Amino acid sequence: SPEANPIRNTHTGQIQGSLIHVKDTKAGVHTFLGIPFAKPPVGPLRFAPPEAPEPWSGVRDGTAHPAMCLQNLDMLNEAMMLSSFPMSEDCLYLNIYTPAHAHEGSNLPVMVWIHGGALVIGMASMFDGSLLTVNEDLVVVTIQYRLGVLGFFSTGDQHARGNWGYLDQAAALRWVQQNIAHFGGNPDRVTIFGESAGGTSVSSHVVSPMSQGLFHGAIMESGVALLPDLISETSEMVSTTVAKLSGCEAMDSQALVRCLRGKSEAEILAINKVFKMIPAVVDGEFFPRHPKELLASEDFHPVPSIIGVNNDEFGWSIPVVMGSAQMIKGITRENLQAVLKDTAVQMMLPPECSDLLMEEYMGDTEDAQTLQIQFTEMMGDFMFVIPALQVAHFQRSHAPVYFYEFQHPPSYFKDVRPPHVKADHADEIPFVFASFFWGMKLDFTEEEELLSRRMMKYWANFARHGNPNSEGLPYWPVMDHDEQYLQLDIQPAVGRALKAGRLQFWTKTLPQKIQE
Numbered sequence: 411s412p413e414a415n416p417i418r419n420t421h422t423g424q425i426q427g428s429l430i431h432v433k434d435t436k437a438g439v440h441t442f443l444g445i446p447f448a449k450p451p452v453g454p455l456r457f458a459p460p461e462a463p464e465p466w467s468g469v470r471d472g473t474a475h476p477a478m479c480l481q482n483l484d485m486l487n488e489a490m491m492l493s494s495f496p497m498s499e500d501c502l503y504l505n506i507y508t509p510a511h512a513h514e515g516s517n518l519p520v521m522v523w524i525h526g527g528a529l530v531i532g533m534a535s536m537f538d539g540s541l542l543t544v545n546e547d548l549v550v551v552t553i554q555y556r557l558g559v560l561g562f563f564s565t566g567d568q569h570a571r572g573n574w575g576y577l578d579q580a581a582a583l584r585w586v587q588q589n590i591a592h593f594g595g596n597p598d599r600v601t602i603f604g605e606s607a608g609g610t611s612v613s614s615h616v617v618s619p620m621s622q623g624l625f626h627g628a629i630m631e632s633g634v635a636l637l638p639d640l641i642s643e644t645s646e647m648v649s650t651t652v653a654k655l656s657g658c659e660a661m662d663s664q665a666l667v668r669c670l671r672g673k674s675e676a677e678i679l680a681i682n683k684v685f686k687m688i689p690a691v692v693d694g695e696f697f698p699r700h701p702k703e704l705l706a707s708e709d710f711h712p713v714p715s716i717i718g719v720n721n722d723e724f725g726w727s728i729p730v731v732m733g734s735a736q737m738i739k740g741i742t743r744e745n746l747q748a749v750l751k752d753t754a755v756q757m758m759l760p761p762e763c764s765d766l767l768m769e770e771y772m773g774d775t776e777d778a779q780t781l782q783i784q785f786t787e788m789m790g791d792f793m794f795v796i797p798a799l800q801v802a803h804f805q806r807s808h809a810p811v812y813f814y815e816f817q818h819p820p821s822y823f824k825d826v827r828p829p830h831v832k833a834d835h836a837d838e839i840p841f842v843f844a845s846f847f848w849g850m851k852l853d854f855t856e857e858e859e860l861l862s863r864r865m866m867k868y869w870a871n872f873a874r875h876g877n878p879n880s881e882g883l884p885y886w887p888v889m890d891h892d893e894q895y896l897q898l899d900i901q902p903a904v905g906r907a908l909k910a911g912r913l914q915f916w917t918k919t920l921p922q923k924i925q926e
């Protein structure tokens with residue numbers, strides 16, 4: 411029988427969790443919250459690799475959510491007295507959801523969720539794994555990792571190599587290998603999954619040599635390792651911005667890192683506040699080479715993967731949160747050329763390419779509303795769709811890739827945002843978790859409940875077998891030379907060669923015009 415207050419072993423000592431959802435489910439869920447997977451990255455461990463967590467005597471309380479990593483709460487709120495929730499540099503914790511029948515040796519598949527938030531916001535407690543664990547009989551782990559300046563500050567040299575947050579994620583995955591059997595998970599059957607910066611994180615583990623053997627499958631929702639804003643060949647803009655805001659100017663790398671280690675949490679938060687996103691670098695430990703080189707390597711051996719995108723990734727929430735929404739509403743045929751020259755610069759293209767962008771996405775269009783929708787379409791393709799299609803192409807010659815486009819505009823958002831918005835950024839997450847953030851219930855239509863049951867079963871079948879297919883689910887073909895992908899909506903359908911024209915434009919036509 412499941413205990414009300416179950417006690418489990420870890421390498422660092424015993425922990426007590428909770429039994430929940432006994433009434434509204436068959437046989438309930440065990441939660442174990444706030445488990446340390448690394449030593450707190452404070453004092454000299456700020457801008458240093460994660461180190462082994464300390465052992466304890468007695469039974470650790472696993473009934474409270476951990477502190478979130480330091481982040482800008484205004485931005486997290488744009489994405490509720492979040493000021494009452496604990497926030498600390500001491501934030502390297504993970505949460506576990508298990509079916510209440512699980513014990514040492516149950517050998518259930520494990521799914522490890524890596525949250526998004528552009529590597530500057532988010533927390534594990536936002537994602538309640540309870541319904542995924544009970545509906546699909548698996549262990550769900552939600553992890554934290556250092557965010558913003560504390561996660562991704564680099565000097566480009568030995569004093570701060572960078573990618574602290576990715577090293578944290580790998581430390582959490584090593585904890586899962588070491589400990590998950592004590593909670594009834596099979597460490598040989600771990601799937602990493604994540605959305606947006608979390609998808610980028612997952613895709614980054616898929617290429618990182620020191621992450622190999624920490625997982626057996628990968629699910630990348632609306633983000634991969636080539637998401638342009640989250641990967642950089644230079645450390646220079648971030649480090650010079652941080653030196654200026656911190657008052658640690660006119661210092662070498664060694665003195666800059668020493669100066670930044672003396673800063674309080676409040677001083678770090680004030681420096682951190684300007685970053686709406688922060689990139690990973692080629693740090694040498696996590697990425698020995700740029701992800702594009704690792705993906706193209708003849709020695710690349712990716713795990714089986716699901717990779718997918720939504721049909722309106724830049725439709726509403728990203729431009730609103732990033733503060734580009736006002737500029738977009740200002741687009742007309744009169745200023746379009748100037749907007750596309752500015753956009754070309756942000757895309758790291760020559761501003762001469764603005765005419766090619768205009769012809770590809772806007773053509774002869776005059777209507778301002780249509781131009782603004784074409785602009786968001788272009789941004790979504792550049793940031794999410796083309797990178798996803800490129801990574802899927804690099805992987806699928808080595809290992810199974812199942813590709814999806816999620817298309818369903820959620821019923822509960824119809825009155826909250828413009829009616830032209832289709833499946834926005836993050837719209838698929840509640841279909842995978844069968845709940846909104848913090849496990850809050852949603853008024854799904856009957857049709858939406860079926861799409862959620864299907865997506866949960868595809869994901870869990872993939873966690874079990876590296877193949878999403880099973881009886882009663884529409885057949886999802888593996889991605890091969892026919893470029894097949896599953897269109898996820900109320901009536902799922904198979905498509906071929908998603909946005910093949912756009913892929914030709916971005917990967918062949920546009921680089922040819924640049925070469926000239």
Ligand SMILES: NC(=O)c1cccnc1
Pocket residue numbers: 526527528529605606607608639640687728
């Ligand atoms: N939410 C995210 O992780 C995100 C949003 C925009 C850009 N990159 C990442």
Ligand SMILES: NC(=O)c1cccnc1
Pocket residue numbers: 725726729730735738739782786828
């Ligand atoms: N129509 C709008 O208000 C809008 C908001 C955000 C992005 N694009 C358009």
Ligand SMILES: [Cl-]
Pocket residue numbers: 446448449450462463464
């Ligand atoms: Cl510790």
